[PDB]
Enzyme design. Sequence first.
Site, PDB file in Angstrom:
ATOM      1  N   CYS A  64       6.612  10.613   7.726  1.00 53.71           N
ATOM      2  CA  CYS A  64       5.282  10.129   8.122  1.00 53.71           C
ATOM      3  C   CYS A  64       4.939   8.890   7.329  1.00 53.71           C
ATOM      4  O   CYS A  64       5.705   7.928   7.344  1.00 53.71           O
ATOM      5  CB  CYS A  64       4.294  11.309   8.026  1.00 53.71           C
ATOM      6  SG  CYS A  64       2.751  11.057   8.696  1.00 53.71           S
ATOM      7  N   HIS A  65       3.863   8.925   6.540  1.00 51.94           N
ATOM      8  CA  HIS A  65       3.512   7.829   5.612  1.00 51.94           C
ATOM      9  C   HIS A  65       4.243   7.877   4.259  1.00 51.94           C
ATOM     10  O   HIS A  65       4.169   6.924   3.459  1.00 51.94           O
ATOM     11  CB  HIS A  65       2.005   7.817   5.340  1.00 51.94           C
ATOM     12  CG  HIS A  65       1.170   7.336   6.495  1.00 51.94           C
ATOM     13  ND1 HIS A  65       0.681   8.184   7.460  1.00 51.94           N
ATOM     14  CD2 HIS A  65       0.629   6.124   6.763  1.00 51.94           C
ATOM     15  CE1 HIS A  65      -0.096   7.512   8.291  1.00 51.94           C
ATOM     16  NE2 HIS A  65      -0.199   6.275   7.854  1.00 51.94           N
ATOM     17  N   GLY A  66       5.053   8.899   4.043  1.00 51.67           N
ATOM     18  CA  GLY A  66       5.846   8.978   2.834  1.00 51.67           C
ATOM     19  C   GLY A  66       6.502   7.675   2.370  1.00 51.67           C
ATOM     20  O   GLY A  66       6.373   7.288   1.229  1.00 51.67           O
ATOM     21  N   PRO A  67       7.109   6.927   3.285  1.00 54.63           N
ATOM     22  CA  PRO A  67       7.784   5.714   2.860  1.00 54.63           C
ATOM     23  C   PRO A  67       6.926   4.636   2.208  1.00 54.63           C
ATOM     24  O   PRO A  67       7.483   3.688   1.605  1.00 54.63           O
ATOM     25  CB  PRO A  67       8.403   5.203   4.156  1.00 54.63           C
ATOM     26  CG  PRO A  67       8.691   6.460   4.914  1.00 54.63           C
ATOM     27  CD  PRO A  67       7.509   7.335   4.641  1.00 54.63           C
ATOM     28  N   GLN A  68       5.607   4.806   2.235  1.00 53.49           N
ATOM     29  CA  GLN A  68       4.735   3.871   1.548  1.00 53.49           C
ATOM     30  C   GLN A  68       5.024   3.819   0.063  1.00 53.49           C
ATOM     31  O   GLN A  68       5.134   2.732  -0.502  1.00 53.49           O
ATOM     32  CB  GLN A  68       3.267   4.172   1.811  1.00 53.49           C
ATOM     33  CG  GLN A  68       2.837   3.642   3.161  1.00 53.49           C
ATOM     34  CD  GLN A  68       1.438   4.049   3.532  1.00 53.49           C
ATOM     35  OE1 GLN A  68       0.945   5.103   3.127  1.00 53.49           O
ATOM     36  NE2 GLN A  68       0.810   3.235   4.356  1.00 53.49           N
TER      37      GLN A  68
END
Lengths: 166, 166
Positions: B100-104
């Site tokens: 999801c937004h983890g790669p931020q």
Amino acid sequence: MKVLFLSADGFEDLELICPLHRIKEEGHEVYVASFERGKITGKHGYSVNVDLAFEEVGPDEFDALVLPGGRAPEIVRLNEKAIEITRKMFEAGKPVASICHGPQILISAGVLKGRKGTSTITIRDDVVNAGAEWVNEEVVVDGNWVSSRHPGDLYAWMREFVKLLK
Amino acid sequence: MKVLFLSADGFEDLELICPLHRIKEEGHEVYVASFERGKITGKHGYSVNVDLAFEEVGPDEFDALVLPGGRAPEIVRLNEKAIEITRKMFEAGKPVASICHGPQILISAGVLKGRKGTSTITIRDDVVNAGAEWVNEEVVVDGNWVSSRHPGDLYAWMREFVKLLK
């Protein structure tokens, strides 16, 4: 395996959705049934798609049953079809996994006399009054019936259930 | 193995909690780290205990890393200590799962140049500008990095990740 979940609005979200993914992981087909096709919404506002209405399920089709908790079992247990599906799959010795309030359905199905399992403690008396022996453990395995108490138990509940599908 | 989650308030509940149980099931140890000890609370109101502060975590302690999504990574990505943990474990080649937004967090760690993976599509452009190849699939494996997009991907994400824990 074809694995069947019985639920309705007000299901405890984790108790449905995490096992759903856990089982798909193994490459099994998962089907969610309820009063009608469409979507149901959990206590915490997650939605899931319903594959089947109770009315259209042949017990024979399915290899294993799951009964998550929340408020849903209180209304599922009033449905004659859902009760029949449950009675049949359970008396056939197919794997059945319940958690939390799930066993309210097993109670209404009349299948617990002389069985042993656990549940959320708030319905212990009702399980005992159905003729089962209640114990307080994170998971119980009683032949084909695999039972746990609450969401903290998930890992152990599923550890034992997946064993039964191998 | 010892598996480390990095998160904070506003985490996407399923993306933290289901893998947490998934990994215990295999009998690994799981630890949740955030800004400080206590509890954090998900978007949908589930609560999880925080075992450690970021500033107590030594990277070498832990064998694998998990980065769930939600609003949490937007604030975790600013934290130098959290960044440094992520940088060290990822560059060391330890297994790192993101959704999801983890790669931020990975973006902010500067580790994505020449890498390949996926995310929620709403940050595709930002992943690409960090110098990764973005693809749209339910799960990608790039060496030690196992990346998915959203909660429907869970089964695939854990299927592939658990493999790296053997």
